[PDB]
């Protein structure tokens, strides 16, 4: 209650992409914050805990080493730009038919203005794992 | 905001060591919290949200195997002592040029007495990436 | 808080040449780096993204397929390869902050003469 809020998960109907859901159940949109084009806006000025986490499969290993990487990142609505708050990069393959998996989680405590966009970016659409529920997710809380 | 809170970041312009820095942008600390002698310092007593993340780098693996450690401790202002509130371990390699990543994250809820310092450590300083920016924090938020 | 371009030059169908960046005044090793382009008599519009790691990239649907983007964050420094070219690409070309243009010192020309 007068708290802005939000909690979203991947969109499991789709492909070789990422969109964030938050017409499903266990999830939340609230208090203003707004998803407008893979990305939540913040409603008001002040401290907000950001956190989000993905999961990567893969069957087998490639021929040539992969690197994956999770980010979020920022808008400042002023001075237009894009800075990098939260990333982590992983590598699963050592070397060279048994699968794979692979998490990654971030989180932390951010002082945001009004209007500022967040984003929270892969770089390997078609390793993600959005099969099952609760695997990958992406949201913001104020305090 | 009457909310005693702090995310510090490493140091890039250091090596073979972890130094915290605050006058960075996106970067906090106020409402009372100090950063002395690279501990985090409680200005008020009561409940914390207190979190960490860390990311190694290695070009190829050592002949011996290495083990890789990140904690978080605290040190209580009466009968001085440094018990262990959050702690992880993690080994990258397996056997025997391509390089490795790895990420290390903690986080939990603590109540806590004023004067008491936080403190997040690990033990293979060189093998540390510092490199770019939000791979390494350490954050705390009162509430 | 300049950044200097360079690179351009005349290029004949099917060649391949590159651009260059330089940056200062801010820490390179943040923000997103958008090569844009702006053509004589057209809109301005964006041709690539990159991310501070490096690992992300994205091009449009018109380009995709021929340019390559990269960066130096040691000498701070942001790249584009140049492959395949075409009289599309006869246009002035900036380094910026945003996609849409911001931040664009200087920008250099390209022409593809058939």
């Known amino acids: 209650s007068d708290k802005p809020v939000a909690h979203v998960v991947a969109n499991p109907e789709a492909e070789g992409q990422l969109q964030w859901l938050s017409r499903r159940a266990n999830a939340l949109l609230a208090n203003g914050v707004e998803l407008t084009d893979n990305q939540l806006i913040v409603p008001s000025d002040g401290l907000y805990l950001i956190y989000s986490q993905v999961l990567f499969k893969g069957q087998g290993c490639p021929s040539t080493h992969v690197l994956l990487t999770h980010t979020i990142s920022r808008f400042a609505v002023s001075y237009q730009t894009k800075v990098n708050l939260l990333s982590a990069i992983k590598s699963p393959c050592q070397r060279e038919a048994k699968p794979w998996y692979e998490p990654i989680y971030l989180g932390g405590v951010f002082q945001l203005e009004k209007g500022d966009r967040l984003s929270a970016e892969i770089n390997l659409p078609n390793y993600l794992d959005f099969a099952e529920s609760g695997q990958v997710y992406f949201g913001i809380i104020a305090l | 905001s009457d909310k005693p809170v702090a995310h510090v970041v490493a140091n890039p312009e250091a090596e073979g060591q972890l130094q915290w820095l605050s006058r960075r942008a996106n970067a906090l600390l106020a409402n009372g919290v100090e950063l002395t002698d690279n501990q985090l310092i409680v200005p008020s007593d009561g409940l914390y949200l207190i979190y960490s993340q860390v990311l190694f780098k290695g070009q190829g693996c050592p002949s011996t195997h290495v083990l890789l450690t990140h904690t978080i401790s605290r040190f209580a202002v009466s009968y001085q002592t440094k018990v262990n509130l959050l702690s992880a371990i993690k080994s990258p390699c397996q056997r025997e040029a391509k390089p490795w990543y790895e990420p290390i994250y903690l986080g939990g809820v603590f109540q806590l007495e004023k004067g008491d310092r936080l403190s997040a450590e690990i033990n293979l300083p060189n093998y540390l990436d510092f490199a770019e920016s939000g791979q390494v924090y350490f954050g705390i938020i009162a509430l | 808080v300049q950044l200097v371009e360079s690179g351009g030059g005349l290029v004949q169908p099917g060649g391949s040449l590159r651009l260059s960046c330089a940056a200062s005044?801010?820490?390179?090793?943040?923000?997103?780096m958008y090569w844009v382009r702006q053509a004589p008599g057209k809109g301005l519009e964006w041709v690539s993204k990159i991310n501070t790691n490096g690992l992300i990239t994205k091009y449009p649907d018109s380009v995709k397929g021929r340019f390559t983007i990269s960066r130096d964050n040691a000498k701070n420094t942001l790249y584009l390869q140049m492959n395949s070219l075409r009289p599309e690409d006869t246009a002035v070309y900036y380094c910026?902050?945003?996609?849409?243009?911001?931040?664009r010192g200087q920008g250099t020309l390209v022409t593809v003469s058939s």
């Open positions: 005044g801010f820490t390179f090793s943040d923000y997103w």
């Open positions: 910026a902050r945003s996609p849409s243009g911001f931040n």
